[PDB]
Enzyme design. Sequence first.
Site, PDB file in Angstrom:
ATOM      1  N   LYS A 281       0.925  -1.287   0.023  1.00  0.00           N
ATOM      2  CA  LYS A 281      -0.038  -0.156  -0.099  1.00  0.00           C
ATOM      3  C   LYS A 281       0.804   1.207  -0.156  1.00  0.00           C
ATOM      4  CE  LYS A 281      -2.361   1.653   3.631  1.00  0.00           C
ATOM      5  NZ  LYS A 281      -2.178   3.291   3.535  1.00  0.00           N
TER       6      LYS A 281
ATOM      7  N   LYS B 267      -7.335   8.018  -1.274  1.00  0.00           N
ATOM      8  CA  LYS B 267      -8.783   8.810  -0.825  1.00  0.00           C
ATOM      9  C   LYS B 267      -9.126  10.062  -1.564  1.00  0.00           C
ATOM     10  CE  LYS B 267      -7.552   6.444   3.579  1.00  0.00           C
ATOM     11  NZ  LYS B 267      -6.156   6.360   3.496  1.00  0.00           N
TER      12      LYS B 267
ATOM     13  N   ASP C  93      -3.348   4.305  -2.314  1.00  0.00           N
ATOM     14  CA  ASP C  93      -4.299   4.567  -0.968  1.00  0.00           C
ATOM     15  C   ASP C  93      -4.374   6.408  -1.088  1.00  0.00           C
ATOM     16  OD1 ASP C  93      -5.709   5.510   1.079  1.00  0.00           O
ATOM     17  OD2 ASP C  93      -4.440   4.199   2.556  1.00  0.00           O
TER      18      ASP C  93
END
Lengths: 218, 220
Positions: free
Chosen positions: B31, B61, B59
């Site tokens: 990640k 968001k 990641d």
Amino acid sequence: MKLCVALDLSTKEECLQLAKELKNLDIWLKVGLRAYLRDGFKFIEELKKVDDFKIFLDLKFHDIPNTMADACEEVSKLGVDMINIHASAGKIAIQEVMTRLSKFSKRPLVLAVSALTSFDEENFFSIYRQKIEEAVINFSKISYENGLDGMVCSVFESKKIKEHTSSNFLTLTPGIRPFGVANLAMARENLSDYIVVGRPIYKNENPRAVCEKILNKI
Amino acid sequence: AMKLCVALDLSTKEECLQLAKELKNLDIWLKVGLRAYLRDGFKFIEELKKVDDFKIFLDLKFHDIPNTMADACEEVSKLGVDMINIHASAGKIAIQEVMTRLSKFSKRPLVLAVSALTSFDEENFFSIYRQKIEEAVINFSKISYENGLDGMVCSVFESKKIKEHTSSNFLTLTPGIRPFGVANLAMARENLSDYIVVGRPIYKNENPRAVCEKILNKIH
Ligand SMILES: [Cl-]
Ligand SMILES: [Cl-]
């Protein structure tokens, strides 16, 4: 109030060319998510070399507090003049961002996104269980009390925000159609501190001429 | 079976690449977070891919207006990442636009929605959403499921409830797992996590590879 141009042309080459056409004008430039993901910090350096434009790096950070603090620190190192975060990230995220930025000799202004201007009432309520106006005031108070410099909001919410916080709490209103309604007269009546104008400038045959007219009108 | 994702959150790019090298040949996901991407950009993803054929979860968001999120997901999807995430709070239109844009790819990454950031406590979350965390998570999961997403990023304690309210095929990725600590492997297994993300227990361990092997051995 200040004029900020949304550098939303499809390619890096077009945005730089536009930046060159707007040299020496007292304006801000806004660089968004797509542009930064594709070209990174080097694009910001190239713009700064075109002219001393004040830059609003519009990434709308929304993650855990420590991550938002690290993110704001990373872009502040680039010397940008303004950045934004989601007020929905909460009070702790806001506090950690401002505590981290206080470590810089000169930090950028930090504004909070209240309600994305793209939302209509029904879809917004489905997520926040609050009317748009209600949420914006709620978010603005949390942002003001926790140390942010202002909010990104619709021109129609700008006066309400200041009334519930401070006339010195900044408001940046995007999507203004200067001669269109969210026009320059609405921004003036609603006390916008910053206006962001996109297509009316970047898709016009003579972008500089449009900026010239807006500034003089201001 | 439950998939192991390692959070590459060491402070510098040299440290993160060295960690990837240490985990070469293990069946795991990596990640990459916001600060790493802001600092090094797409080239860092290219360099990770040169270490080994790891599946990558970028990641970031995303949370912006619909067309901007569509554009963002498209740009990162061009890098060949295997999973991305967006905020469910961006709304149904944003979710629909992201999926419509991603259907243009021959092979798109999985797209999961962030429900309630695991960093929130009840009081501060309520101040923003006017819903308790569990209520919001269920509400967001429904919107995500009905509008085309692959699954949700959620607390391991909500994974089973999310599936019960959508479907067992709707994915759940649960971060902050302390495998041998509680959000441990046992809880992740009982609550049906499809993906677990482990950070410090691996990257701060004296022998990160040994910890990964121990985790994989207990999962299988
Ligand atoms: Cl006017
Ligand atoms: Cl919605």
